[PDB]
Structure 1
Amino acid sequence: DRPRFSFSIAAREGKARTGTIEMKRGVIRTPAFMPVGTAATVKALKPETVRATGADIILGNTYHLMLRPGAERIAKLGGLHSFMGWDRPILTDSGGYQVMTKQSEEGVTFKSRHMLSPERSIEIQHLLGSDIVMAFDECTPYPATPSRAASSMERSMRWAKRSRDAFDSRKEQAENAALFGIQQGSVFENLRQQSADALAEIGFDGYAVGGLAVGEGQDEMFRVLDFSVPMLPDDKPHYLMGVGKPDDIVGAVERGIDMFDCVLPTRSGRNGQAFTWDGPINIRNARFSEDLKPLDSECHCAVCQKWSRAYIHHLIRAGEILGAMLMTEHNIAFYQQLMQKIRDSISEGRFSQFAQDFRARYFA
Structure 2
Amino acid sequence: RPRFSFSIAAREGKARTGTIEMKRGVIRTPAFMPVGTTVMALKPETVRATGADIILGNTYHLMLRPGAERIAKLGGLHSFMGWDRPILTDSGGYQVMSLSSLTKQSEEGVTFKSHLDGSRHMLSPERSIEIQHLLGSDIVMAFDECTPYPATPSRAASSMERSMRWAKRSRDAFDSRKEQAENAALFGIQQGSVFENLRQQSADALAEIGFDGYAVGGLAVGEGQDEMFRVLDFSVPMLPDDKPHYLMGVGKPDDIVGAVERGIDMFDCVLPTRSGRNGQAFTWDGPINIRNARFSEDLKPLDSECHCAVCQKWSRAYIHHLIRAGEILGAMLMTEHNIAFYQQLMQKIRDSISEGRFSQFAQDFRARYFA
Moved more, 23-32 or 134-143: 134-143
Check 1:161–1:127 CA distance in 2 against 1; reply closer, same or farther (3 A cut): same
Deviations 1:203-244 (A, max 9, x none): 000000001011100000000000000000000000000000
Structure-1 separation of matches of 2:145 and 2:34? 23
Structure 2 distance, partners of 1:145, 1:271, is: 35
**What secondary structure does 1:97 align onto?**
helix
239, 249, 256: which is aligned to 1:242? 249
Residue 322 of structure 1: aligned partner: 329
**1:353 to 1:6, Cα distance in 2 relative to 1, 3 A:** same
Distance in 2 separating the partners of 1:276 and 1:211: 28
User: Which one of 254, 267, 276 corresponds to residue 269 of structure 1?
Assistant: 276
> Hey, what does 2:151 align to over in structure 1?
144
How far apart are 1:326 and its partner, in Å? 0.3
Deviation string 1:98-121 (CA, Å, 9 cap, x unpaired) is 101111110011112211100000
The whole-number CA distance in structure 1 between the counterparts of 2:108 and 2:39 is 32
Q: Distance in 2 between matches of 1:77 and 1:328?
A: 28
User: Deviation digits for residues 281-313 of structure 1, max 9, x if unmatched?
Assistant: 000001001111000010000000000001100
Distance apart, 1:37 and its partner CA: 2.1
Partner SS for 2:227: helix
Deviations 1:290-343 (CA, angstroms, capped at 9, x unpaired): 111000010000000000001100111111110000000000000000000000
- Structure 2: distance between partners of 1:42 and 1:14: 37
Give 3-state SS (helix, strand or coil) of 1:27's partner.
Answer: strand
Rounded Cα–Cα distance in structure 2 between residues aligned with 1:97 and 1:191: 20
Q: Is the 8 A contact 1:209 1:238 kept in 2?
A: yes
In structure 1, C-alpha distance between the alignment counterparts of 2:356 and 2:194, rounded to whole Å = 31
What do residues 54-111 of structure 1 show as CA deviations (whole Å, max 9, x unaligned)? 0000000100110111100000000000000000000000112210111111001111
Q: In the alignment, is the contact (CA less than 8 A) between 1:35 and 1:42 conserved in 2?
A: no
Contact 1:96–1:108 (8 Å) recurs in 2: no
Alpha-carbon displacement from aligned partner over 1:243-270 (angstroms, at most 9, x marks no partner): 0000000000000000000000000000
When structure 1 is superposed on structure 2, of 301-310 and 97-106 the one drifting more is 97-106
Give the whole-Å Cα distance in 2 for the aligned partners of 1:216 and 1:311. Answer: 36
Preserved CA contact (<8 Å) 1:75 1:128? yes
2:55 matched residue in structure 1: 58
TM-fit CA distance, 1:24: 0.2
- The CA distance in 2 between the partners of 1:106 and 1:201, in whole Å, is 22
SS in 2 for 1:220: helix
Cα pair 1:7 1:236 within 8 Å, conserved: yes
- 2:14 aligns with 15
SS of the equivalent of 1:315 reads: helix
* Structure 2 unpaired stretches of 5+: 98-102, 114-118
Task: Give the superposition deviation at 1:42.
Answer: 4.4
Once the two structures are superposed, residues 125-159 of structure 1 have per-residue CA deviations (whole angstroms, 9 ceiling, x without a partner) of: 00000000000001111111101100000000000
Q: Distance in 2 between matches of 1:142 and 1:314?
A: 39
Q: Report the more deviating stretch, 161-170 or 108-117.
A: 108-117
- Of 345, 355, 358, the residue aligned with 2:362 is 355
Partners in 1 of 2:263 and 2:107 — Cα distance? 33
CA contact (8 A) 1:4 1:178 kept: yes
| Aligned counterparts of 1:201 and 1:147: Cα–Cα separation in 2 | 23
Moved segments of 4+, more than 3 Å: none
1:55 partner SS:
coil
Select 1:94's aligned residue among 91, 94, 99: 91
Q: Give the counterpart of 2:231 among 224, 237, 256.
A: 224
Instruction: State TM-score, norm by structure 1.
Output: 0.98
Residues 31 and 342, structure 1, Cα contact 8 Å, conserved in 2? yes
* Alignment partners' CA distance in 2, 1:81 and 1:189: 39
C-alpha distance in 1 between matches for 2:64 and 2:295? 41
CA distance in 2, matches of 1:14, 1:87: 34
Distance between the aligned counterparts of 1:96 and 1:102, measured in 2? 13
SS in 2 for 1:199: helix
Give percent identity, aligned residues only: 100
**What is the CA–CA distance in structure 1 between the aligned matches of 2:326 and 2:189, rounded to whole Å?**
39
Change (3 A) 1:273 1:216: same
SS in 1 for 2:194: coil
SS in 1 for 2:304: coil
Q: Is the 8 A contact 1:135 1:159 kept in 2?
A: yes
Aligned positions, number: 361
C-alpha separation between the residues in 2 aligned to 1:119 and 1:28? 27
Alpha-carbon distance between aligned partners in 2 of 1:193 and 1:304, rounded to the nearest angstrom: 45
SS of the residue corresponding to residue 26 of structure 2 reads strand
Q: Is the 8 A contact 1:303 1:326 kept in 2?
A: yes
